[PDB]
Design a protein around this ligand. Structure first.
Ligand SMILES: CCCCCCCCCCCCCCCC(=O)OC[C@H](COP(=O)(O)OCCN)OC(=O)CCCCCCCCCCCCCCC
Lengths: 48, 49
């Protein structure tokens, strides 16, 4: 019923390993660019 | 700078600038430290200008 059984699990292992690498690296690229905004500071100086 | 001999300028320096503090200054010299450059941005938004 499922001749692809073994091959799909071998691929599944490779998919998990690549995701364990790519997810934190892509997460790191997101945080890298966004850090400009996440640490920005604002000040309001109206005339008096 | 101008029409003047360097002899004259040195004579006046030794006359009117001799009273300055000597070479030693009691160990309190200003030593300029290096100044960190920071890649950064500052925006003062003012649409009335
Ligand atoms: C005309 C072209 C049209 C293409 C359209 C594609 C549609 C997008 C579908 C995306 C599916 C994700 C991967 C499944 C395959 C698999 O699981 O990969 C199995 C293969 C092992 O294979 P093996 O051991 O059999 O051989 C081995 C021979 N050396 O390694 C992997 O684990 C790679 C998958 C890693 C994790 C996925 C990360 C996704 C990144 C985005 C890339 C998308 C590119 C899109 C290009 C159009």
């Amino acid at each position: 019923a499922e001749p692809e059984h073994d091959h799909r699990k071998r691929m599944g292992l490779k998919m998990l390993l690549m995701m364990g690498l790519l997810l934190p690296l892509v997460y790191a690229m997101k945080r890298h660019k966004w850090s400009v905004l996440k640490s920005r500071k604002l000040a309001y100086r109206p005339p008096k | 700078a101008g029409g003047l001999e360097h002899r004259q300028l040195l004579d006046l320096a030794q006359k009117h600038f001799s009273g300055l503090s000597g070479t030693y200054d009691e160990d309190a010299v200003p030593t300029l430290s290096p100044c960190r450059f920071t890649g950064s941005q500052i925006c003062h938004r003012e649409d009335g200008l």
